[PDB]
Amino acid sequence: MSNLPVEPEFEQAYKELASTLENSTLFQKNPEYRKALAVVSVPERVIQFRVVWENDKGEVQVNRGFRVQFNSALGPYKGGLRFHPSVNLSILKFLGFEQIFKNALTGLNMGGGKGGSDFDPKGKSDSEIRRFCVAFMTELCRHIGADTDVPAGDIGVTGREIGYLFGQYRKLRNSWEGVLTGKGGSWGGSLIRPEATGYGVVYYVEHMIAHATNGAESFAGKRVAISGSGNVAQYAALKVIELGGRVVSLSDSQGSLIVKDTAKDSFTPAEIDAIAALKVDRKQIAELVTDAAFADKFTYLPGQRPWVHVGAVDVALPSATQNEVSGEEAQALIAAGCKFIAEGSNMGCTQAAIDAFEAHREANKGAAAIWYAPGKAANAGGVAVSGLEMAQNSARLSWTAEEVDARLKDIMKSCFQNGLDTAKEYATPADGILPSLVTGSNIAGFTKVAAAMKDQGDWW
Amino acid sequence: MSNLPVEPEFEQAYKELASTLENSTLFQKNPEYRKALAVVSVPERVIQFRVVWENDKGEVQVNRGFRVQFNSALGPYKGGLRFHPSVNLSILKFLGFEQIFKNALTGLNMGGGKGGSDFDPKGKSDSEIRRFCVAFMTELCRHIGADTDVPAGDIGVTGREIGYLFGQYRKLRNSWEGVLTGKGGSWGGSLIRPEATGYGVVYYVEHMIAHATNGAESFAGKRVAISGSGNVAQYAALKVIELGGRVVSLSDSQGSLIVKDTAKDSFTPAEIDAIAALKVDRKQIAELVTDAAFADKFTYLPGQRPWVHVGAVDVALPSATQNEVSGEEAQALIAAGCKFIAEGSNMGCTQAAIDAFEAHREANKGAAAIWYAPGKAANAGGVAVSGLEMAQNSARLSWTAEEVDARLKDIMKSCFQNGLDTAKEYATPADGILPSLVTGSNIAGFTKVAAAMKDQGDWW
Amino acid sequence: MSNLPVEPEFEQAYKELASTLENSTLFQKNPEYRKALAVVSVPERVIQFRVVWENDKGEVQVNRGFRVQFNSALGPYKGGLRFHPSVNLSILKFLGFEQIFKNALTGLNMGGGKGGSDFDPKGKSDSEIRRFCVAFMTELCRHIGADTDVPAGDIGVTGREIGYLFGQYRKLRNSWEGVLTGKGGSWGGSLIRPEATGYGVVYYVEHMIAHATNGAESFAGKRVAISGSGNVAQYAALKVIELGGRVVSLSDSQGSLIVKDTAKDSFTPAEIDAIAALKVDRKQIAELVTDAAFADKFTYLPGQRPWVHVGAVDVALPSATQNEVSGEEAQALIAAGCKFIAEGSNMGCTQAAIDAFEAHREANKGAAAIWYAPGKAANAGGVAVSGLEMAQNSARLSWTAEEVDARLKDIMKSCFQNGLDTAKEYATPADGILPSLVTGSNIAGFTKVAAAMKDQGDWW
Amino acid sequence: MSNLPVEPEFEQAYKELASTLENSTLFQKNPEYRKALAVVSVPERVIQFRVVWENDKGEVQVNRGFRVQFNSALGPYKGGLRFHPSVNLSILKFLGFEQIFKNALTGLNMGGGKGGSDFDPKGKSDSEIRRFCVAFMTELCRHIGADTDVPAGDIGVTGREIGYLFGQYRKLRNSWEGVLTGKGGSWGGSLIRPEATGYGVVYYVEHMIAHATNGAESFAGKRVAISGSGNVAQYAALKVIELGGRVVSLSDSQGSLIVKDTAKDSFTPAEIDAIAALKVDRKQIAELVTDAAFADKFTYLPGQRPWVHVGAVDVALPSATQNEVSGEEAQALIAAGCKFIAEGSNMGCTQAAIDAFEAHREANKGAAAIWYAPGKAANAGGVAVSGLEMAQNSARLSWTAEEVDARLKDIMKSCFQNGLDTAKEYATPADGILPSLVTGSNIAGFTKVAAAMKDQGDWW
Numbered sequence A, B, C, D: 001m002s003n004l005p006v007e008p009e010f011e012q013a014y015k016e017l018a019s020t021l022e023n024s025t026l027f028q029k030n031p032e033y034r035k036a037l038a039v040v041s042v043p044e045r046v047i048q049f050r051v052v053w054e055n056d057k058g059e060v061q062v063n064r065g066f067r068v069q070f071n072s073a074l075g076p077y078k079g080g081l082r083f084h085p086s087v088n089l090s091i092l093k094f095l096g097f098e099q100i101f102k103n104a105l106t107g108l109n110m111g112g113g114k115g116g117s118d119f120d121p122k123g124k125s126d127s128e129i130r131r132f133c134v135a136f137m138t139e140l141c142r143h144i145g146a147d148t149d150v151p152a153g154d155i156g157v158t159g160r161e162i163g164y165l166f167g168q169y170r171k172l173r174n175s176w177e178g179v180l181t182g183k184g185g186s187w188g189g190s191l192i193r194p195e196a197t198g199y200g201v202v203y204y205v206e207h208m209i210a211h212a213t214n215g216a217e218s219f220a221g222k223r224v225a226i227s228g229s230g231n232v233a234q235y236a237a238l239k240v241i242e243l244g245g246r247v248v249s250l251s252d253s254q255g256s257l258i259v260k261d262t263a264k265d266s267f268t269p270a271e272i273d274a275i276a277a278l279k280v281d282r283k284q285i286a287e288l289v290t291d292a293a294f295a296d297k298f299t300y301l302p303g304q305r306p307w308v309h310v311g312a313v314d315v316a317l318p319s320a321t322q323n324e325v326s327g328e329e330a331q332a333l334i335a336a337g338c339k340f341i342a343e344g345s346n347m348g349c350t351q352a353a354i355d356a357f358e359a360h361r362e363a364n365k366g367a368a369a370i371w372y373a374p375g376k377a378a379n380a381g382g383v384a385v386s387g388l389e390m391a392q393n394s395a396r397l398s399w400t401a402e403e404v405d406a407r408l409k410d411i412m413k414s415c416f417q418n419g420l421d422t423a424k425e426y427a428t429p430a431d432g433i434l435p436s437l438v439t440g441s442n443i444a445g446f447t448k449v450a451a452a453m454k455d456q457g458d459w460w
């Protein structure tokens, strides 16, 4: 197969999943699943399209659009849109592939997909963003629909962009339906959706802490290093604070902002809100670091990730982008006494990082190990609450915040228990060693999809 | 109308419904309903189509495919698919006609339909069945849909076939929706769907027994003769046993399997499970009749139905196919002291059998009479639960087994009460005589559909 | 296959085609075509539907509607609509089946289909026919379209009905297209469409006469017996008269009208026009007995076909309906010196008639033989000009009468020559024996369809 | 733009077009066309999809499917399908990009596209090919249509595959329409389509010879080296022979077959027919090289291209695949006295080859130069005749071979004259130097598309 193009991010995701399935008893019990893996790994459909749009000076602009419709055995294709200058098919395939198995771990009927553009929102006006969304949806509309493919947000796609997208879908197709999630509260949105992914990360990590420490520890007083400062990071930070933890770092594409005293200080909600408002306006954390409220409390480090700069730390929640925790960073976290690392970001850890965490787990009993949770398990609360937004729209009713949050919590607890129990079944650890959440999550998502695919005749 | 082809099974079903309407005060109260009867009896739409498919030897095969869309006043067309070598338009018209009124009795919004093929699953491989299903759905897909027509199983169509069919529908139409029921648990199925029809038949007969005996008797200690050994028979048997009844017979297309001591012994769940596994593989009861587990406890009667061979018996549940209880067999059941017979199978009793049971009812007060219930009342539980599977898919959520079963019990109790009350209203029996469940059920289902049709301008 | 219903007309058409294929070298050269016969003989799709409509008194009326979409390898399904109280699926399957092979002999890209209703235009008002057509098209429109299936007239369906059907299609689908043929001249009709079938029958028999006599004789001076008095019979008669022949009979469903002097007299164009006027008004030939101008010239025979009552005749053109020339009638025609018989009607001759004509051909050298042409060859002018109507509509232009007629002539000549040549190739007659136009036409049409079906993967 | 994946074939085609437009006066006159080039070079739409299909052993197989819908300003997307193990997006984008401008040079209303799969027909049975085509079209069907995108053949896709594709389209979509070209003569094909591309190459080269030699020379007695042995090569060879030229070589993926006497010997039609029959069966030229008819007349060279092995030669028609004439091969042709080289294959010459030819042209007056014609000009007769097949289908009529061939000839003459005249206008050669057909063809195709795009608002 040397006709196939090299897609480094996709291949990284694929190899990690595959290696976890091989390092288990799964293919001894179900060798025929090798065929399922070969089938599932080739997307059902991919659409690519030119997007021509007009800038504020009246000039023609060209960007590339994509939608990867990876798998639909469990439900309509489901997953977000990324507007970032790095975007290409390789990246969106990694993300769509991840999405299959993440979705499967939610318990809801959602297939896996992802899409987006190499359009860069930075430096654009709101009007440019509106015209781009209009043009993007003009092509995308024909391929999506409430029972076919339901997009959502991701890097560079917020409630603002989902609004322009939805309005154009409605104009084009003359239907009002749950074709997108992350919608506005008055026009078919769900309460808890803004909060969902970062809350779910934190909720999942609570279960990790409870298990590893036998209920002795919690987030109360733990020091938590976060990276990113967007949707996932903001609400992960807010939930940590609500639970009495201390957030010692946030970051963005230009640098890290770290409290000067990491033993005892924390970001506050008010500071997070300030950062969030800069981000709505597509500005950098750097703009506020010399203000009164920040110059004395924080150190800004241009060009750096937080991980080697936070001192001793208890929990790490990378929440920005793929491959943002290197192997050297991982070793630094381990040396700083970090015991829990969960991916808010998709594929947040490099392979070297993952290998470092899992070797540590296998070498150190119980609470002495750093315990790593992959994004498909820990960050699934966003997509889960998107499924609940679809369910609301289908019912033509709106649920309460408490009702949505309660379902989110149950979904994240079940997701943790399924990864744990599946790791014990298929990859039973040595005595006193914590089960691999990555292996167990991978096997549990994969087998549910493989078996539904078999039932549906996709492979035999 | 000597241009019309002779369709014996449909004419049989039509005539029995019509005769029960005539033998009542319905047409005195509402003579205009004769117009409704003439309209409803001609199907709204029927699709017939060639199905070409490839056998494991690479050879072209040809079979006939059908979908009868009989009536859609109360909801989208709803009803299963039968793959059996007897299948033709007459058989499928009888079935779809019955389904209109059965569906009306469930209280849910389901029109009547039925379909299938003369494709014979016996002697085929799983791969053959998969290719057939693929080819069958390539044509069927354009006629069906979650709000148009929702098929399901019947003789020869199990969850395996539903899977191949659903998978092809999704591939063709690029939508994940409630287009079929009987689906797998991870991909839109409902708990209780496997159990539903047999459970419901037994639930229904519990009401019969309570009424006729003023609560003095139940299934506990009763001897129950069942025919068939497929989905309906298996779970009717299992519920009879759960209730403390004794199952003295099952049967298949080649013979009956009867306990030697029909006064005291019963099939067990383990024995039912063994037969069920054989049926999954499309093998016959004959294969196990020499096993240890079977040879000493049962007698195999090839070519014979159970009814004359079970001795004294209390309940009969024909659960295989149409016209499987003859007038002679009805007289034998009556002489053997049988006091309850309900159809698991569609049109299970011949007209002579029904005439014998109803004459016996009219001649014998109360608990001295054998009481006959028609399939449209007793066997409605399957389609009812299929409507709940549709409800669940529209909600994008899955209900618990207890939730589904509780709804099933309520539906079967209301069905029984509607038939009893309608018979008392339109066909009031002489003092001490049980009301006619067949006449009451027929009137109740027919009037609901007729009035809805009038409201919708289908007749005036 | 004792599940299959008995369909006498369809079985008759099928058997005659199959028998001519078997009585040839076709299956020695291409034995795999027996697979193509088995596949082609099962219709791709059949739609049946209830048609509820209102009569002039305001009362609900119910009739049965049908559309048999038999084969589409060579083009969109194509074929007319019959409104006659005999209509059922058998009859429409015989028609649609015949149409596959007929359309193949035209050279145009037309698949085979046929439809209609048991609705009886006799005794209905024009308003009642309008309301019927409106209701019938309400369901039929979703199954048809300019590139899908294009209906047309047949018994009981004239340009009046085509108009009501076209208007309802336009209203429902919001499209103006070649969905029907036989349309009016100002709204997409073709010149020569009314004349087409009857003219084409006569043009075809002119080639038979030319071949049988090396050009020495023609219709000039021939005595021609016609049956029926509708679209086919009228224009056949008119073209005979134009060519110098004498039309000695016409007939309807209640009797025959025969010139008193069949050796010397003929219908005139004015007479045929008066009969046509009666038939527009759904009245009978029988009325003309009261008029001395007709009574003086003709004999009216209630309940009789013409064949045994015309004395010596040269050509017979059955042009009414199926099975209107029996074996005894065929023997009478032979004895009366008839040398040419061609079907204007579909399956106009019974199998005993065909067998008599074909035996006579095989026994009698040269011009002493009676020569039989099947409807699929001789009546193909109507559907040929319908294909030209479709071509005009796709071009958005209207051709002259001369252009259309010139094409019709070339199509009928090519049709004759194909049947002649294919018979010489696959069923080569003894020296001096005319080749079988029925065998030749059947093989020619069948091989064209079977080969296209093979190319398209319908069989292998 | 380092997010964009490296697509070497696409970039090669793009750079060559772009370099020819830059090496001219085009952007001095129309600098705004730079924006058109940036727009046009990003495809309007691309679909990729998994194709799962079953082999003759009953095993699941997976391949990748594609359709590149590059540009639709001038017409519906138009271009063939390639089934070859090298296929990927890069290759199909090169081909689809080429197709835009090729189509524009035909004068017909056809946009540009291309598609296919990495499915390898070699080693597969006809049944495997049928099942693959069925599965491929199951997804492709939703994206194509007679007014949207009309595919056709290319490497690995012959009339056989177009048949299976068409049959499945018809089955899925229930329409008979000009959705594909290269169809069978009885089911909407065009005469001259098999012949079209190789005839057109030769026709175009006739014009090259006429111009360069001032009418003094022709193909009569010229020695012509051809590569490939498929559809393009076969009919190029046959037209050369018909015109009295001598074909000294053919080839396939395993080697070259060259006449032993290249001064005076030639392939014959009978030999070409033998080779063609091997190719229908997916076999290699190697199989026949030891037969009587071949061992003495020809030398078979495994692993070699013909160009350095034919001795002195007049005309080269690479007709196999992209990048099959290297720069060293080009120098060898020049040294062997070759004066005309036209691409039957798309992008047949490497850039080094093209640069060698064009430097030779610029250094050698008139008939002393080797004159190179790009595939978009010389091989356009195939797609042109596909446009005429679309026009036939839209008219619902079939043209004669003479009519189609006459249009083909006029199209190829106009295409040559447009490339010549445009090269004289925008890239005027020095005195006595032949105009660049590559530059002129590129500019003439590009400006027609750019201007239609501007008119339609695609850029401004």
Ligand SMILES: NC(=O)C1=CN([C@@H]2O[C@H](COP(=O)(O)OP(=O)(O)OC[C@H]3O[C@@H](n4cnc5c(N)ncnc54)[C@H](OP(=O)(O)O)[C@@H]3O)[C@@H](O)[C@H]2O)C=CC1
Pocket (backbone or CB within 6 Å): A084, A153, A154, A155, A156, A157, A197, A228, A229, A230, A231, A232, A233, A251, A252, A253, A254, A279, A284, A319, A320, A321, A322, A344, A345, A346, A379, A380, A382, A383
């Ligand atoms: N939103 C959702 O529901 C879900 C998101 N995810 C994943 O969470 C992550 C963050 O998404 P989300 O918060 O929604 O996105 P946002 O756009 O709201 O925030 C992304 C953040 O990451 C930073 N960032 C993005 N790209 C890079 C890069 N290449 N290098 C360094 N920093 C970068 C941004 O910096 P800057 O502010 O400087 O632009 C920003 O702080 C992604 O991996 C996404 O796929 C996972 C589950 C659900």
Ligand SMILES: NC(=O)C1=CN([C@@H]2O[C@H](COP(=O)(O)OP(=O)(O)OC[C@H]3O[C@@H](n4cnc5c(N)ncnc54)[C@H](OP(=O)(O)O)[C@@H]3O)[C@@H](O)[C@H]2O)C=CC1
Pocket (backbone or CB within 6 Å): B084, B086, B153, B154, B155, B156, B157, B197, B228, B229, B230, B231, B232, B233, B251, B252, B253, B254, B279, B284, B319, B320, B321, B322, B344, B345, B346, B347, B379, B380, B382, B383
């Ligand atoms: N499944 C459902 O939801 C519902 C089914 N029904 C009706 O219940 C009946 C049984 O259906 P189901 O259990 O689903 O089907 P299955 O195919 O699972 O079982 C059918 C049983 O009947 C036997 N059988 C079938 N045809 C004949 C025949 N012609 N002569 C003798 N025995 C025969 C079979 O024999 P063998 O095992 O030898 O093949 C098998 O034991 C039918 O009348 C059906 O329409 C009613 C309501 C709901």
Ligand SMILES: NC(=O)C1=CN([C@@H]2O[C@H](COP(=O)(O)OP(=O)(O)OC[C@H]3O[C@@H](n4cnc5c(N)ncnc54)[C@H](OP(=O)(O)O)[C@@H]3O)[C@@H](O)[C@H]2O)C=CC1
Pocket (backbone or CB within 6 Å): C084, C153, C154, C155, C156, C157, C197, C228, C229, C230, C231, C232, C233, C251, C252, C253, C254, C279, C284, C319, C320, C321, C322, C344, C345, C346, C379, C380, C382, C383
């Ligand atoms: N129209 C077309 O383009 C073509 C028609 N055909 C065939 O030609 C035949 C005549 O069609 P067409 O002229 O269009 O139809 P019309 O309705 O115009 O004429 C039918 C004629 O046949 C008579 N007739 C109909 N049914 C019967 C019956 N069951 N017994 C006796 N006589 C009967 C009618 O009698 P009455 O007047 O008493 O009702 C009328 O004279 C049919 O077989 C048709 O399928 C063949 C090719 C093309």
Ligand SMILES: NC(=O)C1=CN([C@@H]2O[C@H](COP(=O)(O)OP(=O)(O)OC[C@H]3O[C@@H](n4cnc5c(N)ncnc54)[C@H](OP(=O)(O)O)[C@@H]3O)[C@@H](O)[C@H]2O)C=CC1
Pocket (backbone or CB within 6 Å): D084, D153, D154, D155, D156, D157, D197, D228, D229, D230, D231, D232, D233, D251, D252, D253, D254, D279, D284, D319, D320, D321, D322, D344, D345, D346, D379, D380, D382, D383
């Ligand atoms: N068909 C059409 O209408 C048109 C085709 N083209 C172009 O013409 C060329 C030939 O197409 P066509 O004749 O239709 O295809 P065919 O599949 O009929 O023939 C292709 C030929 O090229 C050989 N070949 C293919 N791939 C390679 C390779 N990678 N290395 C060496 N030899 C190879 C094949 O060898 P083998 O026999 O060993 O398999 C075969 O002889 C292509 O470039 C195509 O895009 C251009 C215009 C129109």
